[PDB]
Every structure is written in C-alpha cells, then in structure tokens.
Amino acid sequence: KKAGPVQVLIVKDDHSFELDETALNRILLSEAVRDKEVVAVSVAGAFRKGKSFLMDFMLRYMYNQESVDWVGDYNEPLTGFSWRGGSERETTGIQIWSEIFLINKPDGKKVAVLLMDTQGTFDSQSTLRDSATVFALSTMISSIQVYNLSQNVQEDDLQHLQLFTEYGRLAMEETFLKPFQSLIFLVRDWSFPYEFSYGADGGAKFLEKRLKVSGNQHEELQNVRKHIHSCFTNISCFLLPHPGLKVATNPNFDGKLKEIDDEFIKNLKILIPWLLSPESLDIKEINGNKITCRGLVEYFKAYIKIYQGEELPHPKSMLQATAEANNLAAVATAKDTYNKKMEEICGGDKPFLAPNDLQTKHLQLKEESVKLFRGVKKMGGEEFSRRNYLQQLESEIDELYIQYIKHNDSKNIFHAARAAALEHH
Amino acid sequence: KKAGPVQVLIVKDDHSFELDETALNRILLSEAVRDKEVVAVSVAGAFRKGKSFLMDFMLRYMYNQESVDWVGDYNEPLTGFSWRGGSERETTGIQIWSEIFLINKPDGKKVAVLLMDTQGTFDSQSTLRDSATVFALSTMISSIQVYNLSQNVQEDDLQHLQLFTEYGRLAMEETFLKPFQSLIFLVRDWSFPYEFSYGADGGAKFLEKRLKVSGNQHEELQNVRKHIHSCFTNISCFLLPHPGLKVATNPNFDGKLKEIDDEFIKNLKILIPWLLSPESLDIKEINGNKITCRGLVEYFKAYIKIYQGEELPHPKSMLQATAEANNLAAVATAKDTYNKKMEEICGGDKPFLAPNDLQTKHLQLKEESVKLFRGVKKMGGEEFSRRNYLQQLESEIDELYIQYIKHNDSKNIFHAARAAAL
Ligand SMILES: Nc1nc2c(ncn2[C@@H]2O[C@H](COP(=O)(O)OP(=O)(O)O)[C@@H](O)[C@H]2O)c(=O)[nH]1
Ligand SMILES: Nc1nc2c(ncn2[C@@H]2O[C@H](COP(=O)(O)OP(=O)(O)O)[C@@H](O)[C@H]2O)c(=O)[nH]1
Ligand code: ALF
Ligand code: ALF
Ligand SMILES: [Mg+2]
Ligand SMILES: [Mg+2]
C-alpha cells in the first residue's frame, strides 16, 4: 500500500462531525511512531486558495529533503492531497498524510512529522460552525499553522482568525501559557514586492505593521490584534508571488513546475524548507507538555468530543450575533421595565389590589413593555425579533405576573371569601 | 473647467463621517440636472480590488459612449478617480464624479447619471462600522451597486453583503417593496472559464447556483440567501478575467490598455455597456418613487445624519458581538435563576422569613447566580465578562433582593390597637 491522504475528520451532510479513529489510530498509533514526539503542520484558511496544492509541494520536500533537488523534475505532475481548479470546494473535513515522517533534529531528537490538510473556510456548503470547527481543530492539533490568505491580510481575515482561534481556545484545557505555537500568515498572490519583498522578510515587515498593537487604535482594531498575539508564541508571514495565469486558469495544468512562474518557484523553495527543515520543526506542546503521536490522538478525540457536544457557544455571523445581542438587551430592558412598574402598584409595600384591577394594570404594563421592546431598533429588525424573542419576552412577563398574583393574594387571602359573605349580606 | 473626482462623504481619523454638502450641492443641484431623474452607479467591496480602476473605465464609456472605440487609445493612461497599487487603501469615504452625464434612455426620457466610488471595506484603519457605513450608504444611494469581489463568491462575502445591506435597511423608512434595486456580483480574476464562461451568462449560471435556496440547505445558508434576494429587485453576475500580472504587480503600470491582458479587455468592453448602456440605466427609486438629483441630495443628507448619530445599533465583529450576546444571555440566566430561587423562599405563597435568614439565603442565592454566570462558557473570555457584566449583574440582583425584602415585610404586620381590641 502506497502512502496517500487519509480522511480523519469527517463533516456529515447534517453538519455533524465524526473522527475516523480507526484510520487515525492506524497512522499515529503504529509502533514506529506512537511514542515519538510529534510535529504537526497544518494549512488552513479560505477555500479554493491553493492549500492542498501547497501541501503537496511540502510532501515533495518531506520525501526528498536529502536529495539535491527536492522540488521535483519540472515535468512531474503534483500529487498527494487532492487539489484542482474549479470554484467548488475539494478538501472536506481534515485529512492527514498516511506516512508519518521520522526526522532527525540537530539536537539528536527523532521527531514524527504529521501533515494535515483542511477544508477551506467559507465554502457555500458549510455553516460557520463547520468552518470554525475545522480551523479550530487544525490549529489546536498543529504545532505549525499555515494561515493561507489571498492577496492581502484584510480586517475580515483578522476577525475570522480571532473567531476561529477563540473557538479553539474555548475547547482547550485552561492554561497560563499561550494556547498555540506557530502561525504563518501565508499571503498567496502578493502583488506589491516593490513595497514588501516576496518571502519571509518582506512578510515580517508587512505583518509587523499590519498586526501592530497601538493603545491609540480604536479598541475594535486593537483587540483583534491583541487576541492574535495572545494566541501564538510565534507569528510569521511569508509573501508569495502569483504562480502565473497557467496555474490559476489553465484546466490542463497538473502541477508541473515548467508551467509555474519562476519567481513563485524560487520563493516556494525558500518557504517550504523554512517551514519544514529539521531545525524549524517545533514539537507540538499542549498545556506545557510535549506531545507524542499517541497523545495527539487522545487530544484529537478529546477536542472533537467537545465540538460534537454543545458545551461551547455557537459561532455566529456578524449579523446573527449582533441581532441576538440587540434582542437580548431589549428583552432585558422590557422585562426590567415591567418589573419596576409592577413594583409601583403591587410591590411589597403597596396595598392589596383586587384581582381584576391587578389584571388590568398587568395587561397594560405588559403591552407597554412589548411596545418598548418592539420599538428598539435592532439588527435583523422586526421579523427576527418576532420569530425568536417576542414570545420569550411575553412568556417571561407572564411568569412575573403569576409571581405578583401570589404576592398580591398574600396580602388579603380572604378577599374572595369575604366578598362572597358580604355580597350575600 | 475640468471634470474630476469630488470627495462627498468624508471619513475622519476619529471614525466620524462628514458630508461635504457644498460640494454635493454644486454637482447635483445645478440647473441642468437638479430636476432630472437620477441613475446612481456605485462600486463597493473589499479594499485594494480594482474598484477605482474599474470606475475610470466606466468614465471612458460614459464620455465616449457613441464611439465603437470608447475603451480608449491603447497608449492612454487611465485617469479619473485615483487608483494605484500598493497594499494601503487609497479611496476613502465616498467620492463622486463632478460631471453628471445626461443620457437619453430608449423611451426618450433623459436621465442624470451619477458615478460613485467608495472606500473598500476591511482596510487596516477602519472599524466594521466604518466599512458598513460606506457600503450601506453607497447601496442606499445607488440604483446600480457593483459588488466587486475577488476570484470567487464565498460565504463570508454573502454574510458581509447581508450585514451591510441590513445596516442600510436599518437607516431606511419602512417599505412594502424591496429596499434596493440592481446588484451586480462582479467577480474579478475569475479563474475557471472552463467551469463558467467569462462574462454575464457564465456569471448568471454561477451566481444562480451560489444564491439558490434549497429545502435541504441548512437554514443558516438559506437565511443569508433569502436576505440577499429580499433586498434587491435585480441580481446579476459578471465573471471577469484577470487583467494580467503587469496590471497586478508592476509599479509603473498606469492603466494603458497595451499592458492589459486582451481577454480582460474583451470582457471589459462587454461589461461596461452591459452595466451602463442607456437601456441598462436603472432610474433610482426610494420606496416606489423615482428620485431626482435634488431628491438624491436630500437622502444623502438624511441617511448620513442617521449614521452620524446613535439611533442605530453598531455593527460589531463576530467575536465582540457573540461575546456580548453570550454575556447578555448568561446575565439573564443568572438573574432568572436568582428570581426563581428567591420565589421558593419569599414567593407570595411562602411564609414570612426572619430578616437575618432572608439575608443569609439572599447572599447564598446571589453567590450561586454569580457563580453560574461566571462558569458559563462564553466567547470573549472571563476578563471580558468580569470587566463588563459582573458588577452590573451583582447590582441588579441586589435591587431584586430589596423588592423581596418589601414582599417579605408585608407578611409580618402587627397593629397594636387592633390586637388590644381583639
Ligand atoms: N492564484 C493562485 N492559484 C493557485 C496558487 N496555488 C495553487 N493555485 C491554484 O488554486 C487552485 C486550488 O488549489 P487547491 O490546493 O485545491 O485549493 P484548496 O481548496 O485551498 O486546497 C488550483 O487550481 C491551483 O492550481 C496560488 O498561489 N495562487
Ligand atoms: N488582480 C487584479 N488587479 C487589478 C484588477 N483591476 C485593477 N487591478 C489593480 O488593483 C490595484 C488597486 O486598484 P484600485 O482601483 O486603486 O483598487 P480599489 O482600492 O478597489 O479602488 C491596482 O494595482 C490595479 O492595477 C483586477 O481585475 N485584478
Ligand atoms: F476549496 Al478547498 F481544500 F479549501 F478544496
Ligand atoms: F483600497 Al481602495 F479604494 F478600496 F483604495
Ligand atoms: Mg484543499
Ligand atoms: Mg478606490
């Protein structure tokens, strides 16, 4: 059996997740690797952006780093993880390479290298939770996360990175250390080498500016950068040239280097050993402990079990989350107002109210609190409120009303009995 | 007296917005155009994606429409709205062309055409509110919005469009009609003509598949699409080839067609008249009324005034907004828990409680509700909860306690004169 890609995290059609433990155990629990300290390299980011393609050049280096020309014969097609053109996603879930690479580090340590390829985020078959779970899991498992971006590092990219890494952090053991190790902002099709050079040095200068935290920036900009810095012990950036229009657009392209732009190739041959050379391979650490292949299986099972449950808050889009916050805040105000107004008429220090007098004032105050809730301008507007929050508000007000019923009754328990006795009299 | 770009929506370093009303009035209130029905064409989308570059080719068409060679001499630099390479944003706010084009529609109606160029969203200096205000205002003002995207239409693109259009709808008057008119998904650097042909027909098939609502689709995917369809009376899509690496990467490139990929040019010459030909020009309508240039000016002013205040909720990042929702929900659960636990000992059907016992049970139940609040897993971290919600929750529980003191005291009454009489 030849080495090949192995699907380990499956996303089902109903957006539930399954770990193929058998497949994962077969690769990571073999006698040759299971007790080896593990290096886990992942690539993640927006879909359809060359992630699998890049990983297959990483495989070439992993297999041929001892040869003079690891990058390959210029007529050799690019194989391994499945990659292709087209606007529909190819990789789903998380796949790993079936052959764990045993690599000697300069300090004599023999480490196991795992390569992890991921479903691109934001394809139109996936919920936000699907995309967040894949990104979070790949970040939580990897010791090197290659965050693959197109053309630029935009503010929505940083917000997505923040959301996905937060989602990962929420599923992890509490720790005083940073949750993750190495992040690489890999910018595909960097177009401004005259501004910042292709490679890791122009990348570092670009990203140093782009991620810099200033106490004088708007807190929204500050906090996304603070978050990202807090998550990773090392953050780097590599700017890659466009690979040429043949790579991007020719359907007959199959990965041959003779059809890839030369400056892309030069930088690819710098990028890959920079990421993967024996010196650069950071052993995976979780909660301050170096992890073996066997222990990584355990964390993969632990982490996925959390995401298969419902302990964590659901990832929400900007509009959904803001609409919910807007509605939650207005429900609280409307209910608080109903409470305070009811206290004015049937608080503990107020006289007993006849039941239909209490009912009249409750119905009026309930209506006033519903009109107040409805009047608050909220994202998603009236339709989202009515379907998801109005019934909750009216129901909770009703509950408060029944409490006030009992409070009020307590002040004159014989009201109805005495009334009936007196009506006869 | 040369036409040029005019900054009308000014964005300041403090993230405030200013309308240059003098400049806007000078352009759209002149005698020749003030009473004409207006067509407003905007381009909007992520920053650094060639929006101003595109609009400058729109300018060439708008001036040289009658000519077969409107695209220009192949040695002519591209001028108009400022465009350039570099990773840092150039256009800010909203600028318009100072010359309003007068066009005869096929039915003989003469309309005024306004061209709007916008600050790309998500640049490194902008809050989400900044980006949403620009995108929403340009959508609310334009009758044709070219949503300029790079390479593909991704689900986050649809979510951004939903957020920005929702933010626009929030500032508009209630209506029984769709709020906006024409939207064009312009996919720059479309790389898969073997899957969907370059141009409008390939774009239509591609976008139809992207925006289709299906019954078996997760409702989160359904809902963003239903929103987008509910917002626009016409949604189309154009797939544009990459312009060539020189356009993308050469710092001396200045817009000469001779340095632009011929297949890009071929589709560009189809795109611009497809967008801007007299038949294509959609007269701006707001809530079912066609708008004039003078009417459009008032809406510029009215809409920005709404965004300049705080009547509306602010757009927030996914994490910020989720953290707030998570904490608001946990606060409500904590207080609701305290309420129901207090009802078990001081509800109307419970006996009078000695004040010291009530205090002790309050203190315990408050602490339980605070522990509940703090233990609930939330986005944003424990410090966000502690700094922004914990003390208010404790204070609100303290207020509820006082209500319960009064309910409890009502159960221990003694009237000395009544007792001595009894
Ligand atoms: N524009 C561009 N295209 C690339 C690059 N690298 C690979 N491609 C092309 O991008 C497409 C998607 O590749 P793939 O690895 O399957 O993307 P993935 O979905 O992110 O894994 C293929 O057609 C590749 O030839 C790049 O750096 N820039
Ligand atoms: N890749 C690519 N670059 C383009 C395209 N159109 C223009 N450009 C380049 O994009 C860069 C930014 O253009 P500009 O109009 O200032 O972008 P804007 O910020 O969206 O207004 C310039 O270097 C243009 O030469 C396109 O279709 N594809
Ligand atoms: F679109 Al992909 F791996 F991100 F096929
Ligand atoms: F980056 Al821009 F106009 F969107 F300069
Ligand atoms: Mg892939
Ligand atoms: Mg611009």
Numbering used by the authors:
A (entry chain B): 30 to 454
B (entry chain A): 30 to 451
Paper text:
Here we present a case of an early onset, complex HSP caused by a novel ATL1 mutation, where an asparagine residue is inserted into the middle domain between arginine residue 416 and tyrosine residue 417 (N417ins), the first reported clinical case caused by a whole codon insertion in ATL1. The protein with the insertion mutation crystallized in the presence of the transition state analog GDP•AlF4− and Mg2+, diffracting to a resolution of 1.9 Å. The structure was solved by molecular replacement in space group P212121 using isolated G and middle domain fragments as the search models, identifying two molecules in the asymmetric unit. The novel, dimeric structure aligns with that of a corresponding ATL1 WT protein bound to GDP•AlF4− (25) with an rmsd value of 0.386 Å, both structures depicting a tight crossover dimer of ATL1’s catalytic core. According to the DSSP secondary structure assignment, the inserted residue results in formation of π-helix from residues 415 to 419 (50, 51). The only exception to this observed domain translation is residue R416, directly preceding the insertion mutation, which shifts 3.6 Å in its C⍺ position and rotates outward.
The ATL1 protein belongs to the dynamin superfamily, members of which comprise a canonical, large GTPase (G) domain, and function in a variety of cellular pathways including vesicle fission, remodeling of organelle membranes, and immunity through antiviral activity. ATL1 is a resident ER enzyme, residing in the high-curvature tubules of the smooth ER, where it tethers and fuses tubules following GTPase-driven reaction cycles to generate and maintain the ER’s polygonal morphology. It has been established that the N-terminal soluble module of ATL1 consisting of the conserved G and middle domains, which we refer to as the catalytic core, is sufficient to carry out GTP hydrolysis and nucleotide-dependent oligomerization.
